[PDB]
Amino acid sequence: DCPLVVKLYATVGLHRYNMLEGTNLYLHKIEKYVVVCTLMPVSYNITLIAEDPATSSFVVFETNVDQRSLGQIDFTCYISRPKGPNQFFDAKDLPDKWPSKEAFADQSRFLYKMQKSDWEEHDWIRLYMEISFFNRDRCLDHNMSDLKILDVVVETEENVPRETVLKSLRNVLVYIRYDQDLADGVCKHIAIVRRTVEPTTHCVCLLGESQLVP
């Protein structure tokens, strides 16, 4: 069967397309992928089938991702479109902690404390959590249903309506507090992910780091 990283990158590609086009294409299957390894796998060219329930059609779809790390989120999605751009990455440091109360009080910074309904209606938040969890240890037999979102904060560069933060493909910094179900209790996680979007190409770069809650 298909490696989890390929399924996740296919879903990232559908995320980029759906957000830019206002569509609801869902992953049906992976047909094939080509990976370039300069020892490390650095590029994936994935051919996938998406389902479009609005027309009951299955659309062959191409996604291209360049990957720069195996141990944390660090990749760029360059192409994501029906089948038939220059390098873009993020070099600036990530915050190492959840935003403090003073970050909210700082009127030059725009932070959005999400409600459960907000992340339930916009599943790219769950996607970024799932990719973060995967990069903690890619050798595990991941069960994404063990993950439960507890709190989400998004930071933008501009003072915009909450709907824009959730629905438009713009630059965001996402903080996700989530529990991993263990019988042996739960494990407490925080993921921090910066999405940067190239203004003309709309290429999407994700840079992320994960931490455990004491």
Side-chain angles (χ1 to χ4, degrees):
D1 42 12
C2 185
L4 180 51
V5 66
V6 175
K7 180 180 167 182
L8 291 171
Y9 285 160
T11 307
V12 169
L14 290 175
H15 160 51
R16 173 173 182 268
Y17 184 84
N18 283 332
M19 296 264 298
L20 285 168
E21 298 302 309
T23 52
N24 286 275
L25 299 186
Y26 302 112
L27 175 63
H28 174 67
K29 69 184 297 287
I30 310 292
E31 286 272 12
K32 60 157 173 169
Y33 63 96
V34 183
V35 47
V36 177
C37 308
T38 55
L39 264 44
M40 168 181 67
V42 292
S43 70
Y44 285 86
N45 170 17
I46 303 164
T47 303
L48 56 125
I49 308 305
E51 181 171 5
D52 171 17
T55 66
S56 309
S57 46
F58 289 80
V59 180
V60 55
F61 193 90
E62 174 175 24
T63 297
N64 288 12
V65 166
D66 284 355
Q67 170 177 260
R68 293 171 290 276
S69 177
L70 285 340
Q72 76 185 92
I73 292 183
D74 188 356
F75 65 83
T76 301
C77 178
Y78 290 99
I79 301 276
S80 63
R81 61 186 179 197
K83 210 182 182 192
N86 314 126
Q87 189 191 1
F88 176 71
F89 58 85
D90 173 5
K92 95 263 325 155
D93 291 348
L94 286 168
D96 64 328
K97 305 180 199 305
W98 200 269
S100 64
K101 310 199 67 175
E102 4 155 351
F104 297 94
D106 181 351
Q107 291 187 9
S108 71
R109 295 178 63 180
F110 311 110
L111 287 86
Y112 300 76
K113 302 185 195 182
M114 293 312 178
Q115 195 225 107
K116 187 160 183 294
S117 66
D118 290 323
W119 65 72
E120 287 185 343
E121 288 156 356
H122 302 89
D123 62 12
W124 65 261
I125 294 172
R126 170 168 49 85
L127 176 59
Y128 294 11
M129 172 188 62
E130 288 178 352
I131 299 172
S132 301
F133 182 68
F134 169 71
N135 279 284
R136 292 195 50 92
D137 190 311
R138 292 152 84 116
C139 303
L140 266 296
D141 192 72
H142 306 90
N143 187 352
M144 292 317 181
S145 70
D146 297 339
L147 306 184
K148 173 182 180 188
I149 300 176
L150 301 178
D151 194 10
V152 177
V153 170
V154 179
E155 179 165 6
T156 62
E157 324 178 335
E158 310 164 357
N159 189 335
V160 300
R162 177 174 291 238
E163 311 89 83
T164 299
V165 180
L166 291 155
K167 294 185 195 293
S168 80
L169 192 66
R170 54 144 300 126
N171 291 356
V172 291
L173 188 61
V174 190
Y175 305 86
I176 307 175
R177 170 76 179 81
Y178 66 99
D179 280 351
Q180 168 197 1
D181 188 9
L182 295 190
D184 283 317
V186 299
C187 182
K188 303 190 298 187
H189 299 275
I190 292 171
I192 301 175
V193 180
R194 185 185 294 110
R195 181 217 292 157
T196 56
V197 183
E198 207 290 328
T200 310
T201 62
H202 305 307
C203 297
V204 173
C205 173
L206 297 196
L207 179 65
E209 290 181 344
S210 289
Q211 61 185 259
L212 297 183
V213 180

